[PDB]
Design a protein around this ligand. Structure first.
Ligand SMILES: [Zn+2]
Ligand SMILES: [Zn+2]
Lengths: 80, 325, 79, 326
């Protein structure tokens, strides 16, 4: 259900069909704990299941992440 | 073999580093460590690059060629998928790394050792395949795409600076077990400010012996590149810019932080309607920037104390249907 | 305080004109205006939402962003 | 009284409802309950509106006038702030409501009338202009579109939201009131109406408690408070404003198909714009065109034929914004 995405490598794999023309780097999104859902450019924290979309050039993965879900543990270091 | 067809829709400008003398007519120099790439695979595939080296050019003149081997000899030439082209680069940058490390395996001796063990380089690589643009990045070199808008000239940087000022890079180092605040505070790690680089045997294998990187379950300074999803270039009309740190670094020192990407792009625009060849376009801007630097230092005032000299400057331009004239 | 819907609405007085979604609707959705751009935040999950576009659903976008902002799940009906 | 200066940069087209007869081209009709507004305050303030009424036109012909009294007689005419303009409308729509409710306070043919006025109501869309800033107040399912001319096409964006049971927000609002989402969204209808907000309708506004679907509710499930839309910058713009009744976009949709209706309607208004002398003509032309498309579809029936037994009143209001008429 939701166990395979704790591992960073897997999260990355979910980006193979990510919409070309997107600003933020896939690898960076994954590092940030994000996972690609499948619709548009929407992604979700494997921790807080919060989703993030509508990226723009110059965005920070962890940045927008902290803003949207100011507590997605991963973002707060409860995962080491 | 390092001699395939070179691209003809791409120009390059460059100026070695130089140091001034408090005596006005001063101008010194040092061994130049910066390289570029503008090949074109027989299968109609484009590969451009800018490698800014540090502490010896025994690395820049390596990655340059070696990267070509693992890219223009088939591996990429084909009808591959987006994620596929990404996977090939990843594999590519790795081969160069692992290979290079094995290279560096062969009293004025301690003199050389400390050198190659600390030699390294950073790179920006741009690839073209069916009006789809790909940018692989490792370091602080910038790559900008300039589309011509009917309301101005749009300028957008395709990559991100791998410095300690990068919220993401910092976070990555944090998860490794280091302290953010402390790292961001010094802003420097082993003479370098870059958080990712090719080579540098020292920090890659002995980071554990450096007070700042002591605590780390993995390499704090990695060489893995940051790939940027294909960019649609079909209806586009402008140009691609790949420039080394030394360049945007100088222009920044004189005029001031920020607003540098636009200004350089603005310059490339003008010179574009005043030249016969791209190389000319390119060189023109490098010279113009080189000028603004010296002038600022000479006609010193406030920003004068920021231009004691400047490192190598490299600029690569790849036209996309923009009016040369 | 922002538990009260009327208060949340009050924080929209200086909301940037030209925005698609109706203020009143945003508040009903539990959002409150921060002050920067068109960024708003659930008074419950403190989750923020920005970059609205025409045709957006306050509750919709909200449930997507923070699929658990209690408010959105009904654990709020003071009565 | 209700006779102030009319706007001259706004046209209107309309066609009463009509029903089709199996025999074909045969049509009928019923009392028409739709009204519009195109005034201009002496202080140079513009007020446009389109009210689609239901169950009697005793309401549409009221809110129309009464709304004007609480808006064009000062209250709005001035150098007000954005939030101020919103506050005034809010107070305006309320005065019309409370007033109207007090209005409805009057053989056995009596029970005949009662069930009428107690169930009479209307929905409305109001557009206001003040220094190239556009405001849209909305109650119901009428649409309001802004059409800017792009150097890459014609931009079409709907300024308001449809207050139906398919509205994620409207549903949630009714949920917080204590009703069941799924069940309400399922029936998709509440008291013959699909709208979740409307003016008048004494029955459901005071006796909602006696209706199985609305039984559990701490407050009125069907409210009349309008949804205002922050001022719109119209300085450098160049296009036109469209206010259209449900009956219109509803018909067009039944023939051609759901969605893509706003653009198509706009697309039509574009063409006819270069083929007319007056806005009214532009307007009427499109209403006729749509009225045609409907009848034809039913006649030359096939698949979508089973969706055009008839059509409700159709009203279209157009307010030019520097678009080429000639
Ligand atoms: Zn999260
Ligand atoms: Zn929430």
């Amino acid at each position: 259900k939701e166990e395979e995405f704790v591992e960073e490598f897997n999260r990355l794999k979910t980006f193979a069909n990510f919409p070309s023309g997107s600003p933020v780097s896939a690898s960076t999104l994954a590092r940030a704990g994000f996972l690609y859902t499948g619709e548009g450019d929407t992604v979700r924290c494997f921790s807080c299941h919060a989703a993030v979309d509508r990226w723009q050039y110059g965005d920070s993965a962890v940045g927008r992440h902290r803003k949207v879900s100011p507590n997605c543990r991963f973002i707060n270091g409860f995962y080491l | 073999t390092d001699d395939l067809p070179l691209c003809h829709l791409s120009g390059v400008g460059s100026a070695s580093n130089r140091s001034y003398s408090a005596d006005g007519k001063g101008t010194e120099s040092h061994p130049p460590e910066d390289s570029w790439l503008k090949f074109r695979s027989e299968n109609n595939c484009f590969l451009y690059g800018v490698f800014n080296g540090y502490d010896g050019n025994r690395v820049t003149n390596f990655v340059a060629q070696r990267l070509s081997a693992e890219l223009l000899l088939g591996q990429l030439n084909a009808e591959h998928a987006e994620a596929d082209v990404r996977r090939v680069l990843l594999q590519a940058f790795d081969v160069v790394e692992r290979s290079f490390l094995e290279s560096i395996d062969d009293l004025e001796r301690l003199k050389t050792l400390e050198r190659e063990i600390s030699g390294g380089a950073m790179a920006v690589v741009a690839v073209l395949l069916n009006n789809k643009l790909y940018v692989a990045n490792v370091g602080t070199n910038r790559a900008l795409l300039c589309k011509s808008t009917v309301d101005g000239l749009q300028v957008t940087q395709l990559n991100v600076d791998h410095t300690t000022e990068n919220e993401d890079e910092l976070f990555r180092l944090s998860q490794l077990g280091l302290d953010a605040g402390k790292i961001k505070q010094v802003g420097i790690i082993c003479g370098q400010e870059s958080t990712r680089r090719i080579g540098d045997y020292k920090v890659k294998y002995g980071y554990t012996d450096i007070d700042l990187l002591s605590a780390a379950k993995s390499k704090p300074i990695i060489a893995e590149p940051e790939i940027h999803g294909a960019q649609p270039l079909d209806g586009v009309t402008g140009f691609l810019v790949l420039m080394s740190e030394g360049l945007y670094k100088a222009l920044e020192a004189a005029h001031g932080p920020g607003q540098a990407n636009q200004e350089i792009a603005a310059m490339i625009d003008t010179e574009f309607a005043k030249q016969t060849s791209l190389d000319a376009v390119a060189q023109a801007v490098v010279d113009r920037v080189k000028r603004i630097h010296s002038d600022t230092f000479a006609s010193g005032g406030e920003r004068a104390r920021f231009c004691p000299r400047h490192e190598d400057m490299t600029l690569l331009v790849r036209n996309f249907g923009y009016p040369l004239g």
